[PDB]
Amino acid sequence: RSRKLILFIVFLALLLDNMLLTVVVPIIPSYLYSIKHEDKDLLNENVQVGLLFASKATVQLITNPFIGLLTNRIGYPIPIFAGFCIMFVSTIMFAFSSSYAFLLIARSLQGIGSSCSSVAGMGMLASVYTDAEEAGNVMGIALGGLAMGVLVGPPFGSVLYEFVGKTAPFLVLAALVLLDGAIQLFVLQPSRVQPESQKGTPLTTLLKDPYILIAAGSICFANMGIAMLEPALPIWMMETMCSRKWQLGVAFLPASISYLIGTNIFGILAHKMGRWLCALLGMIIVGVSILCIPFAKNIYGLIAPNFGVGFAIGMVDSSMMPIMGYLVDLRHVSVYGSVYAIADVAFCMGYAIGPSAGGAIAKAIGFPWLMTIIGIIDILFAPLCFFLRSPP
Numbered sequence: 440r441s442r443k444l445i446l447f448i449v450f451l452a453l454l455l456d457n458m459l460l461t462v463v464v465p466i467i468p469s470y471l472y473s474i475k476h477e478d479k480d481l482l483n484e485n486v487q488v489g490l491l492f493a494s495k496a497t498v499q500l501i502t503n504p505f506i507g508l509l510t511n512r513i514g515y516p517i518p519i520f521a522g523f524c525i526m527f528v529s530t531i532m533f534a535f536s537s538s539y540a541f542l543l544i545a546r547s548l549q550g551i552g553s554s555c556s557s558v559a560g561m562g563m564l565a566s567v568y569t570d571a572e573e574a575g576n577v578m579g580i581a582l583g584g585l586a587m588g589v590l591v592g593p594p595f596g597s598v599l600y601e602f603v604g605k606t607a608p609f610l611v612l613a614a615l616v617l618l619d620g621a622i623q624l625f626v627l628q629p630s631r632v633q634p635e636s637q638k639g640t641p642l643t644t645l646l647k648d649p650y651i652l653i654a655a656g657s658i659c660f661a662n663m664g665i666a667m668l669e670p671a672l673p674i675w676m677m678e679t680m681c682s683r684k685w686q687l688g689v690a691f692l693p694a695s696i697s698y699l700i701g702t703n704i705f706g707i708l709a710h711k712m713g714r715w716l717c718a719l720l721g722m723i724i725v726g727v728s729i730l731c732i733p734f735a736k737n738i739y740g741l742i743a744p745n746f747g748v749g750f751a752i753g754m755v756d757s758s759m760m761p762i763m764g765y766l767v768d769l770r771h772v773s774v775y776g777s778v779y780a781i782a783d784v785a786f787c788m789g790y791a792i793g794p795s796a797g798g799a800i801a802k803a804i805g806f807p808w809l810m811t812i813i814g815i816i817d818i819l820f821a822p823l824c825f826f827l828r829s830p831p
């Protein structure tokens with residue numbers, strides 16, 4: 440029946456959540472720098488913005504188990520709507536807060552909102568569709584919104600902030616979220632759909648599988664690279680290249696564009712190149728690009744390594760999703776939500792361990808040494824993907 444509306448709702452929710460996640464990057468560190476300064480200074484700022492950026496991932500990791508039980512007992516629509524309500528509250532807080540603590544609280548609330556939406560929307564979208572093969576395409580469209588949301592984020596936030604102020608982009612996000620919530624609450628309230636009773640193996644024993652662990656570690660490291668890049672590159676650019684405030688999003692644009700291109704091409708080229716081969720090459724490439732990043736002096740020197748990072752991360756994600764699915768289907772019993780639960784756990788871990796440790800290491804020894812360390816870790820972990828050597 441009216442299932443395309445549900446697909447649209449989930450797509451919009453994921454896109455808006457990722458947009459709100461990635462708009463913060465060019466604006467918050469510069470704003471805190473301007474407050475404090477107008478060296479131990481900006482170093483304490485790096486070590487504090489690391490925690491501020493890791494707060495959302497930590498809260499999401501903690502609150503993820505509870506939302507599944509809640510939607511099991513009560514049904515998807517209430518968590519789906521609560522996600523938009525909490526996202527609206529968090530967006531208004533960021534726009535009208537100046538202190539550090541209120542920014543931390545807004546990020547924490549965004550964590551719960553993101554987790555609730557990511558769980559309940561995926562559950563509804565999986566439940567509503569009838570064909571498993573048709574279910575294959577619709578997930579790709581849902582994740583496509585996530586990749587597109589992180590694309591227009593940094594440039595829209597940075598250019599709008601530098602010309603108008605600190606409030607315009609957050610107000611725009613508030614308006615869009617309110618419109619989406621109005622659509623959700625008005626256009627459809629026909630029935631309250633409950634999740635399927637087919638529950639697979641618990642995530643604990645699933646994570647206890649060594650092959651699942653290898654795939655999860657690969658994904659976690661590949662995402663932790665860019666997760667550590669995100670909250671420190673603006674500060675390094677401002678301190679070294681004395682760049683204006685509108686270029687801090689143009690710096691991150693090529694990475695997102697390359698992520699889109701790499702995901703799209705290798706979602707078709709993976710099974711012809713061999714999935715383990717594609718993942719191995721992706722890990723090696725992202726390691727080398729991360730190694731090459733600190734050698735730039737101008738943005739023109741940052742154009743290429745960001746391209747490589749985005750391309751390789753797309754390769755790794757596209758190669759590692761179906762391998763996770765196949766391993767879960769073979770060694771255990773499988774439901775469509777188990778793969779996304781594993782992927783969400785890996786992503787939240789990569790974004791929770793990245794920024795804090797990255798800030799601490801950058802304060803201790805510097806930015807280039809941190810990038811060298813993470814690149815070498817990626818290079819060393821790359822050959823471990825050989826154990827995904829399934830004969831088909």
Ligand SMILES: [NH3+]C[C@H](O)c1ccc(O)c(O)c1
Nearest residue numbers: 589662665694695698749752
């Ligand atoms: N899965 C998303 C991935 O971490 C990511 C995030 C932001 C980006 O600009 C990107 O290229 C990739």
